[PDB]
C-alpha cells in the first residue's frame, strides 16, 4: 500500500512470501535493531538492505521469520523481535512475554516432562481401554 | 523550457481505478425470472440430478434397433 | 502429545549440546537440583512443527522425538496453504 | 511516466508475491476483464452466469462432434447438441455443490447503485449461497442452449489444410 | 417391442456414481 507508506526492510518484488492465507488466518511478522546500512540474505528467497525505521518485515509463518538469526545471528545484533498479527488483534503474544533468549531463568510456564511414569520400563504397554474416569487425558 | 513540456496533459493522471467503461448492455430482466427453476433454486439440485439424468441416459442408453457396439 | 516426542534426559544442561528447532523449546526451567540445574523435556509446545532436529544434539538418552503427534493442525505442517 | 509506472512489487509492500511485471497489470489487459468478475462484481452472478454460460457454451462442439469417439457425424444430432449437452449438466451441479462450500443466508439486492462501491474487502467471499445460485443458474442456461446455436447454425466452414 | 435390456450399467456404473461423488462430497461439507 501507498497513502499509508511506512516501509523499513528494503527489497523490490518476489514470488516467495506472504499470500492468501495470512489474511484469511493468522500473520506473524519480525522486526529488528541494526548499525550501518547492510544488506541481507532473506528468507524466501532474494536478497536486499536495512538502516532502520521500525526495521519491521511482516512474514507468513513463524518459522520463516526465526531464521533471521540462524543467519541474522551470524551479523551483530542484540535485539531481533517477532510477534503475532491477526486479523483483529492479540492473545498470543509471541516474543513479548518474560525475558527473552531460550536459556535462562525466570519462570517454569509448562513443559513437565514425565507423563504419568517416567522413561523407565515401559515395556508396560498401553493400560486400561480408554474410559472415562481414570487420569489419561495429559 | 520547451521540453520542460508541462507533461502534455496530465491527464488528471491516473484516469482513475475510475472510470474507463459504463457498464453491461441492457439484455437483463429479459432473463427476469425467465428461465427460473434455478432462478426458484429454492430447494432443488435433488430433483434435477434424477430428473435430467435420466433423461440423458434412460433413452439415451435403450434403441429400438441397436446400430451396435 | 498433542504433541509428545521424548527427548529428556537427566543432564538437561545447555551449553554445547542443543538449541536448533524453530521455537518449540523455551525452556531453562531449573529443577531443584540436576547439576547445571535446567531441566525437563520441553515449554508450551502448541507452536511449532515436528522436527527431531529436537535431539539429533543433546541428549535423550532412550528415544530422541520424530514426528509423534498425529493430532496435527496445520500452523503444525508449514502448509495450511 | 517513469521507468514502468512509479516502480513497484505488487500495488505496493513487496511482501506478498504477485511480482507485478506485465502479464499482470498492464493497463493493456487489465481493462480487458472488468467487466466480468475480475475487480469488481458488477451486477450480482446472476447475469453474468450466461455469457458465462453460453460463451463456454458454443465451444464444446467440434471438439465433441470433429474430434467425436467415432467422428466426421453423419447423423442429424451431432455437428452440435448429441450428447455433450451433457458436458454442461454434468458441471452445472459440479458447481452447485461447490456453493455449499458457501452458505451465508441473505437478501439485499444490491446489483442496484449507491455510493462508488469498493465492495471494500471485496476480497476474500462477501459473496453468499444466495448469489452463487443466480450464476450457477445463469450457468444452465448458457450451457444448454449455448449447445445449439452452435448446433443449430448450419456450418459454413473454412477447412484445409495442409 | 425388442432388444432393450440397457439400464442397469449407468444406473450403477454411471448414475450410482454420481450420487455418491455428489451425496457424498458430504465429507468437505452436507
Ligand atoms: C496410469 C495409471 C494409473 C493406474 C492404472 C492407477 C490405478 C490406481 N490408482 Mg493411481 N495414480 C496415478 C496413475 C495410475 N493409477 C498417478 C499418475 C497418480 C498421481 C501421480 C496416482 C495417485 C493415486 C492415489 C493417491 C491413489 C491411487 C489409487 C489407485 C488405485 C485405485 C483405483 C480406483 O478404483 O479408484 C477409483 C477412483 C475414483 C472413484 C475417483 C475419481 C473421481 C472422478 C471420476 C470424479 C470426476 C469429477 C467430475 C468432474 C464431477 C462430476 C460431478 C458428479 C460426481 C455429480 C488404482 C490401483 C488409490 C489407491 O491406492 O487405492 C487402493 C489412491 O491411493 N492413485
Ligand atoms: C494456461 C496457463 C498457464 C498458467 C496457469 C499460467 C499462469 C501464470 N502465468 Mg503464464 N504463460 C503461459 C501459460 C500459463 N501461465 C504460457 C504458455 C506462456 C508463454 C511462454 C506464459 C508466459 C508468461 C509470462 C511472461 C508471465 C506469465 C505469468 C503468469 C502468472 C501471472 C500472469 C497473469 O495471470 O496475467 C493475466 C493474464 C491474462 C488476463 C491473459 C489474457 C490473454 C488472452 C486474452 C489471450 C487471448 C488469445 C487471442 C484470442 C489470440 C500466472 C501464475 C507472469 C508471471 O510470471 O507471474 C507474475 C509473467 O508475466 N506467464
Ligand atoms: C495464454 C497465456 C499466457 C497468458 C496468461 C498471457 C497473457 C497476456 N499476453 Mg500473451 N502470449 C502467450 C501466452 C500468454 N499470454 C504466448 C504463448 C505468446 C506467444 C509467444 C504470447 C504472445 C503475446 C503477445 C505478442 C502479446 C501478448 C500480450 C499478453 C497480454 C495481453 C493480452 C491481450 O492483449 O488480449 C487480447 C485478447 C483477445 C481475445 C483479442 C482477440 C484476438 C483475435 C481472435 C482477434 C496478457 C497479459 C500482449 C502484451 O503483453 O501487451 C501489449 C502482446 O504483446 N502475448
Ligand atoms: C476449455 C477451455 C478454455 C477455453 C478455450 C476458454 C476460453 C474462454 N474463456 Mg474460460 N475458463 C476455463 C477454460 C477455458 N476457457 C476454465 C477451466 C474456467 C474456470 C477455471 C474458465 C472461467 C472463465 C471465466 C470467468 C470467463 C472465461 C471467459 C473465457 C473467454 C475469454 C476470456 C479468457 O479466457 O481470457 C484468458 C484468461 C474464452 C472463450 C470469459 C467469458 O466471458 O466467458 C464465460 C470469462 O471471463 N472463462
Ligand atoms: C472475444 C470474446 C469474449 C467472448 C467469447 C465473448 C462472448 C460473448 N459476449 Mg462478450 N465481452 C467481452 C469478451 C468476450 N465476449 C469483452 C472484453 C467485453 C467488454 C466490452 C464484453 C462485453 C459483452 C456484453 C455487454 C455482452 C456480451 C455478450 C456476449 C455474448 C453474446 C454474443 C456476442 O456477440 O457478444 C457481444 C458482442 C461483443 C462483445 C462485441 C457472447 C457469449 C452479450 C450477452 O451477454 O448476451 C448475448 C452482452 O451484450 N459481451
Ligand atoms: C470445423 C468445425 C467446427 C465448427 C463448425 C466450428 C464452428 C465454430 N467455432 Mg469452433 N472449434 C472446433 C470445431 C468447430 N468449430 C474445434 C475442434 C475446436 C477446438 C478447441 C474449436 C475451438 C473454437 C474456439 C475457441 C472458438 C470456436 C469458435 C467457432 C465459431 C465462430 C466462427 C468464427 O471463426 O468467428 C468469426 C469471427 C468474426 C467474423 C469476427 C464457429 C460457429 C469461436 C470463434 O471462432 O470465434 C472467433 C471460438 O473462438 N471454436
Ligand atoms: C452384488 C452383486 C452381484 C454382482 C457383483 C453383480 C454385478 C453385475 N450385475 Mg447384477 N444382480 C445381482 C447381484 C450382483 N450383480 C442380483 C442379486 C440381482 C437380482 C436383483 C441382479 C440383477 C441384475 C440385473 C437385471 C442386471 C445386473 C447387471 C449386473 C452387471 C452390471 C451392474 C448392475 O447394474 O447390476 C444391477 C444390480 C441389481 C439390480 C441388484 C440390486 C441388489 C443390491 C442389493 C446389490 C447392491 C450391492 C452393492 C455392491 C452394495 C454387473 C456385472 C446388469 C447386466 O446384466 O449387465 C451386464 C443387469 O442390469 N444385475
Ligand atoms: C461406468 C461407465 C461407463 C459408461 C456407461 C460409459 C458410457 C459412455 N461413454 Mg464412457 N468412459 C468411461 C466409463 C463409462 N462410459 C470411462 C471410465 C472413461 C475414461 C476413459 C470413459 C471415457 C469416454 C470417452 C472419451 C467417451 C466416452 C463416451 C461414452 C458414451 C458412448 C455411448 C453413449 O453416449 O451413451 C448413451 C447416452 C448419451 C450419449 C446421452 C444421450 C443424450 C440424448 C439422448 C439427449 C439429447 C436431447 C435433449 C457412453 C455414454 C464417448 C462419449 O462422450 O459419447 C457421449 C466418448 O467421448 N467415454
Ligand atoms: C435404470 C433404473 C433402475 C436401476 C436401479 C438400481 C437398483 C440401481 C442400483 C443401484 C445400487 C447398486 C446402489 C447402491 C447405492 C448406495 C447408495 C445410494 C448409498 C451410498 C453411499 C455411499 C457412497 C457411502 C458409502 C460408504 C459408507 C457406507 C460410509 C462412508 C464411506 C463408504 C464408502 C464406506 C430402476 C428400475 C431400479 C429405477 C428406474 C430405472
Ligand atoms: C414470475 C413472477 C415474477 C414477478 C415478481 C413477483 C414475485 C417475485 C418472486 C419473489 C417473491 C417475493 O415477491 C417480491 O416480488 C418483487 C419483484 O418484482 C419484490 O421486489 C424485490 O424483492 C427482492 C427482495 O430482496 C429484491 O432482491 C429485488 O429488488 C426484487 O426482486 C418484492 O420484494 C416482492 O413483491
Ligand atoms: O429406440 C431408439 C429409436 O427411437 C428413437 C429415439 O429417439 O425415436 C423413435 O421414436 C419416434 C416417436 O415418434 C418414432 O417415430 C421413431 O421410430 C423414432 O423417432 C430413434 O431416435 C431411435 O431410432
Ligand atoms: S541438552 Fe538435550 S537436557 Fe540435555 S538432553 Fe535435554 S535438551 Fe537439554
Ligand atoms: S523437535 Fe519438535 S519441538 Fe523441537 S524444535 Fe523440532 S519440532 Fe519443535
Known amino acids: 500500500e501507498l497513502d499509508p ?4 526492510p528494503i527489497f523490490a518484488g518476489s514470488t516467495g512470501g506472504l499470500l492468501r492465507k495470512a489474511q484469511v488466518e493468522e500473520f506473524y511478522v519480525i522486526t529488528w535493531e541494526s548499525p550501518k546500512e547492510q544488506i541481507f540474505e532473506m528468507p524466501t528467497g532474494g536478497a536486499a538492505i ?9 512474514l507468513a509463518r513463524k518459522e520463516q521469520c526465526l531464521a533471521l538469526g540462524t543467519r541474522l545471528r551470524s551479523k551483530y545484533k542484540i535485539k531481533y523481535q517477532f510477534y503475532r498479527v491477526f486479523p483483529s488483534g492479540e492473545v498470543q503474544y509471541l516474543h513479548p512475554k518474560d525475558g527473552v533468549y531460550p536459556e535462562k531463568v525466570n519462570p517454569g510456564r509448562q ?6 511414569r517416567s522413561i523407565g520400563k515401559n515395556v508396560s504397554p498401553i493400560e486400561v481401554k480408554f474410559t472415562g474416569k481414570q487420569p489419561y487425558d495429559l | 523550457d520547451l521540453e520542460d513540456i ?3 496533459t496530465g491527464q488528471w493522471d491516473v484516469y482513475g481505478s475510475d472510470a474507463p467503461s459504463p457498464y453491461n448492455s441492457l439484455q437483463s430482466k429479459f432473463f427476469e425470472t425467465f428461465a427460473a427453476p434455478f432462478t426458484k433454486r429454492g430447494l432443488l439440485l435433488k430433483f434435477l440430478i434424477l430428473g435430467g439424468g435420466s433423461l440423458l441416459t434412460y433413452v439415451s442408453a435403450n434403441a429400438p434397433q441397436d446400430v451396435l457396439p | ?4 516426542v521424548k527427548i529428556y534426559d537427566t543432564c538437561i544442561g545447555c551449553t554445547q549440546c542443543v538449541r536448533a528447532c524453530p521455537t518449540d523449546v523455551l525452556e531453562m526451567i531449573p529443577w531443584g537440583g540436576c547439576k547445571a540445574k535446567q531441566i525437563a523435556s520441553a515449554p508450551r509446545t502448541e507452536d511449532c512443527v515436528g522436527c527431531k532436529r529436537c535431539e539429533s544434539a543433546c541428549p535423550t538418552d532412550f528415544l530422541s522425538v520424530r514426528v509423534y503427534l ?7 505442517m508449514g502448509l495450511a496453504y | 511516466k517513469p521507468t514502468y509506472q512509479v516502480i513497484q512489487p505488487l500495488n505496493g509492500d513487496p511482501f506478498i508475491g504477485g511480482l507485478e511485471t506485465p502479464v499482470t497489470s498492464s493497463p493493456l489487459i487489465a481493462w480487458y476483464l472488468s467487466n466480468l468478475p475480475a475487480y469488481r462484481t458488477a451486477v450480482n452472478p446472476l447475469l453474468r452466469g450466461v455469457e458465462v454460460g453460453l460463451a463456454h457454451g458454443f465451444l464444446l462442439v467440434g471438439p465433441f462432434v470433429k474430434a467425436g469417439p467415432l467422428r466426421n457425424t453423419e447423423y442429424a444430432g451431432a ?20 456453493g455449499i462450500a458457501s452458505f451465508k443466508e441473505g437478501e439485499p439486492s444490491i446489483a442496484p447503485a449507491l455510493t462508488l462501491t469498493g465492495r471494500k474487502k471485496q476480497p476474500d467471499q462477501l459473496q453468499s449461497a444466495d448469489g452463487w445460485a443466480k450464476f450457477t443458474g445463469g450457468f444452465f442456461f448458457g450451457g444448454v442452449s449455448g449447445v445449439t446455436w452452435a448446433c443449430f447454425l448450419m456450418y459454413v466452414l473454412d477447412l484445409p489444410y495442409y | 417391442m425388442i432388444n432393450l435390456p440397457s439400464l442397469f450399467v449407468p444406473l450403477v456404473g454411471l448414475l450410482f456414481p454420481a450420487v455418491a461423488m455428489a451425496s457424498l462430497f458430504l465429507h468437505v461439507e452436507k
Open chain 3, 1 to 4: 502429545m498433542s504433541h509428545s
Open chain 2, 6 to 8: 508541462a507533461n502534455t
Open chain 3, 70 to 76: 498425529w493430532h496435527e493442525t496445520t500452523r503444525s
Open chain 1, 5 to 8: 507508506n511506512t516501509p523499513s
Open chain 4, 79 to 98: 455437428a452440435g447438441s448429441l450428447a455433450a449437452a451433457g458436458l454442461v449438466v454434468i458441471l452445472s451441479m459440479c458447481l452447485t455443490m461447490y
Open chain 1, 111 to 116: 513443559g513437565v516432562g514425565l507423563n504419568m
Open chain 1, 50 to 58: 536495512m538502516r532502520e525505521g521500525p526495521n519491521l518485515l511482516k
